[PDB]
Amino acid sequence: KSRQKELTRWLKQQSVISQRWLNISRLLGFVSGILIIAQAWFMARILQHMIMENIPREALLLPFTLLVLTFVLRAWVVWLRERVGYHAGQHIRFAIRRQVLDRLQQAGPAWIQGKPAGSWATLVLEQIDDMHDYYARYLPQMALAVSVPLLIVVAIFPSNWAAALILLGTAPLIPLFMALVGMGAADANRRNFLALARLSGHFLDRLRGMETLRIFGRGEAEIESIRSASEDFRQRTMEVLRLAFLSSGILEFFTSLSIALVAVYFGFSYLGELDFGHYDTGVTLAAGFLALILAPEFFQPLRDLGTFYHAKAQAVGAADSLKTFMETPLAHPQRGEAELASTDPVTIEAEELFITSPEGKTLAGPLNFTLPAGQRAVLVGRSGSGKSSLLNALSGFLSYQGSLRINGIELRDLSPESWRKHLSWVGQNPQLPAATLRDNVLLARPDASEQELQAALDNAWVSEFLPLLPQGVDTPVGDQAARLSVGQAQRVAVARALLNPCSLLLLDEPAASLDAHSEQRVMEALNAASLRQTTLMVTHQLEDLADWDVIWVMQDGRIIEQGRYAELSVAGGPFATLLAHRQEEI
């Protein structure tokens, strides 16, 4: 029940996707074993004539011609079997990556937010591609490791049963020395590739913290920590590799012994010191070369299975990360079929709402708010109070076990595909996922008229800094919208949210971590667009909330206070504490 054998059991179940490609590769490995025997038989019949019968080379143009074809056919099957092996591994990675993205889109932004996007890319991109050489090179070779050795013996048995028994005698001894130390070392080695990944994650840890090591003088002390951690890893690995490398040494001993024994048996059978092993006929030279040319080819499929050890070792490491990813249970939000009848501003209701993360953890405690149609509420509080979760639940990203009724219709009943067509969110950070700056604004409706695009650009004040861009509205943004600063990248997200008329607008701190000028332009645009529909805003700019008609001071996942800004700033409750803490900024 070791993990090494559980992950290999997982890797094989993914191979039924390319079962046709692994079957063709297993059939061509049988033909390779037949052309190897044909090569050895022709080479042995040529060598007997030129050594024993002293036939000149010009009289052997028939075995040479058949020997060249056996070599050309051998190189063609190797070329075929190497391309079929790729198609085996390509179609398994394509399907696993499709399963990973499906498992990751369904979980939604709630669970994707758990890990950095760099780590998700490692799983989807580096680790899935690490399984290729297991399916393209290792699995087709573990089938060649039994097709050819068993086929070699069938070819030597008719000619000489003692030379076939020398090779066949070593057949069970090789796996017998795998039941002694093979299982022990192979799983121990799997835990040494993990330590190698940790040691690589301890050098990266010292590289990410050279700013802290610089200001404390620990530059020379962390060189000794790198030296000690590296020397620690090598010693424990060389304690296991002192035993793991016995497999390669032993297999290189049986192939030496078999080649030696085939030469000693045949060598002394020709001299007359031995009189067994042949079917009552004198042992020939062509039989000696057949059983000697085929002695290295008996163990070559096994000795190339150690060449592909890192194909298995790095695929089992990738299976470890992908098996758990596809096995961790998540609690997706419950979707339904109901559709909103009207496009008029929605009314929000809540009774004992309990927002929960996919892993089951409760984020926001009992909520009992109510937002009539067309009104603009505000969420305020400290960081970690659950107010960014409340907006996730309203979007459909988080499951809940309370009551959250939209126009009197439960949110579980609403179909997510049609609910989110009455929903606009500006969000904490821009996250522009399109190519250009025009394709980001037109994300909602790409077929917008050129006049309507200008309406959003002017309202969101995107056009005031457009000439500063090299290409204007068509300026590419690249990765993470690095062409334009976060102050003017957020204004692109505002123009995208104001493009089409919606029913509920969510604003999760749109003007946080923004410059002074961009924040002024964003607010004036989201303070004019918050009156057009049901708005709910998370903010910490508590001095500007005089206009908003409802404020929800939310702490520890609970709305602990309610009311307008007029009656809360003088009430002395938790809002006055929050407002005072904001007034100390400059």
Partner: protein, 561 residues
């Protein structure tokens, strides 16, 4: 290829373990080549000798060569794997130590590169790729070249025209073919790097922006585009296998041409013999077993392109110029430091020993680089920074790092034990003397269950923003320095914690000069000589009462918002 010289010169350390791992690879290759060559001759010589020639055949000499070539092949393979893996871990450590030693003296300025988190994942992966140069590139290519020469030199005693046509064939396919296959797939290997980095670009923008794609109904059409990049990418990987398949078929045909030539050429005479007899199989079996050395060479040369690409990236970083030079003069650290500045970005101020200053800037617009150039992240060109009546540029690093203890805005959690995150400040501090500080800074919840042995950072026990700020102050309190630089403390902290940390400073930094920079007005009454500035220019300064009475800019800050 000249980019690898800085990393082939690191091989002088452990140059015997490295050279033993290549000798053992050659010996193991030659024993297998000589085990099949001796066996092939033995069957031929004993067959022509026959039963009549049993006497005076002298089969004890081949027996001691059969016995010798088997031990050196099974022991050589076991020890070639041991020595070459041991040497690979030793050159990886020396690459890690060399890279860290070069990358540290240029930490702030030399590493302000795009995608700092991604810049260092490449460095770790590039150091890993330089580690492959020995086993993946040097050991196969050098091991194959020596085996071809030893075979050719040793096989030329029987005949010159036959050793030079087998060794010549093996030398042509070692020197000509690996480059013809690296250049034939340099186009396929360049749009395979382009597509790999484009799929990652589209995948990250599809995972990071999943909230804004589902809401606006574009998640499906930005994955269909994503799947099209993968399909284009999976074809460039297919062409890179249509060319690896050909390089393996061709290797089988070159080894098939050597066997055919040896069967043909050596049947017309070996040396001067008209009928070589047993010597025909010596050349044929030396051509069957000799092409096991040339199996890795085509893929060994292909990996050399990636090792060179990593060796130019690491040399881009480590071969930079540090912007700060530290004189080597052993001096004394003072118990009380008076900081003075003169026209530096400028601004000038006086910080007498024992007093607490507060520099009050306008919400990141100033983005105070004063603390960076005060710990010598870069030399100040504007003016002079004097540290206790001596210019700061004249202070040894081992003494400068002791007279200035700075808490940074970005405090780092070193993915180690809670003890190792606090011996970082004062290495010699006792465990009891380290538990007192943790309890004294509000970090009591950490000592609950095996706290000082509890893994922090990546492994587990991730600290919260308020708790992670109290750890930076814990480091500054253990690392006793007469001058403390508070870089934006109590930013992003709740009003309960912020009041608890400003009180932490006033009672425990009582005898230490501090230099606090903030954009928050809370608890500045306890700081003498508050300094308020904007865009790198001192507007006014003075005590909290004196600024309020002056009815200046600081008065406006306290009046509304």
């Amino acid at each position: 290829m000249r980019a690898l010289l800085p990393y082939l010169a690191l091989y002088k350390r452990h140059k015997w373990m490295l050279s033993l791992g290549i000798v053992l690879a050659i010996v193991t290759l030659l024993a297998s080549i000589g085990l099949l060559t001796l066996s092939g001759w033995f069957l031929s010589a004993s067959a022509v000798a026959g039963v009549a020639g049993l006497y005076s055949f002298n089969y004890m000499l081949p027996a001691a060569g059969v016995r010798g070539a088997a031990i050196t092949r099974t022991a050589g393979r076991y020890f070639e794997r041991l020595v070459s893996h041991d040497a690979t871990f030793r050159v990886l450590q020396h690459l890690r130590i060399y890279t860290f030693s070069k990358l540290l003296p240029l930490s702030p300025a030399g590493l302000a590169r795009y995608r700092q988190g991604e810049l260092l994942n490449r460095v770790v992966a590039d150091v890993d790729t330089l580690d492959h140069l020995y086993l993946r590139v040097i050991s196969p290519l050098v091991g194959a070249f020596v085996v071809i020469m030893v075979v050719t030199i040793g096989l030329s005693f029987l005949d010159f025209t036959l050793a030079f046509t087998l060794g010549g064939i093996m030398l042509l396919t070692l020197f000509l073919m690996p480059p013809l296959f690296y250049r034939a797939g340099k186009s396929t290997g360049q749009n395979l790097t382009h597509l790999r980095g484009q799929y990652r670009q589209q995948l990250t923008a599809w995972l990071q922006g999943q909230a804004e794609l589902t809401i606006f109904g574009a998640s499906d059409r930005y994955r269909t585009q994503l799947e099209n990049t993968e399909i284009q990418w999976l074809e460039a990987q297919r062409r890179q296998s249509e060319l690896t398949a050909l390089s393996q078929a061709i290797m089988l045909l070159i080894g098939a041409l050597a066997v055919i030539l040896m069967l043909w050429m050596a049947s017309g005479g070996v040396g001067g013999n008209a009928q070589p007899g047993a010597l025909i199989a010596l050349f044929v079996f030396c051509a069957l077993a000799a092409f096991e050395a040339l199996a890795p060479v085509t893929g060994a040369f292909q990996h050399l392109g990636q090792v060179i690409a990593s060796a130019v990236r690491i040399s881009d970083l480590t071969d930079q110029k540090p912007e700060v030079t530290f004189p080597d003069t052993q001096t004394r650290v003072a118990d009380r430091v008076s900081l003075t500045l003169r026209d530096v970005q400028g601004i000038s101020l006086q910080v007498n020993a024992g007093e607490h200053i507060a520099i009050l800037g306008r919400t990141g617009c100033g983005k105070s680089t004063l603390l960076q150039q005060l710990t010598r992240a870069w030399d100040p060109q504007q003016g002079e920074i004097l540290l206790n009546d001596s210019p700061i540029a004249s202070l040894n690093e081992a003494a400068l790092r002791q007279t200035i203890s700075v808490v940074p805005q970005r405090v780092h959690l070193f993915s180690a034990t809670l003890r190792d995150n606090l011996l970082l400040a004062s290495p010699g501090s006792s465990d009891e003397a380290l538990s007192e500080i943790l309890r004294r800074v509000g970090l009591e919840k950490l000592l609950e269950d095996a706290g000082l042995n509890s893994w922090l950072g990546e492994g587990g026990r991730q600290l919260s923003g308020g708790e992670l700020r109290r750890l930076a102050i814990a480091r500054a309190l253990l690392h006793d320095a007469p001058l403390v630089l508070l870089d934006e403390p109590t930013e992003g902290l709740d009003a309960t914690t912020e009041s608890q940390i400003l009180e932490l400073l006033a009672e425990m930094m009582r005898e230490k000069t501090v230099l606090m920079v903030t954009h928050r007005l809370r608890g500045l009454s306890r700081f003498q000589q508050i300094i308020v500035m904007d865009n790198g220019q001192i507007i006014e300064q003075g005590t909290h009462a004196e600024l309020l009475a002056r009815q200046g800019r600081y008065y406006q800050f306290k009046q509304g918002l």
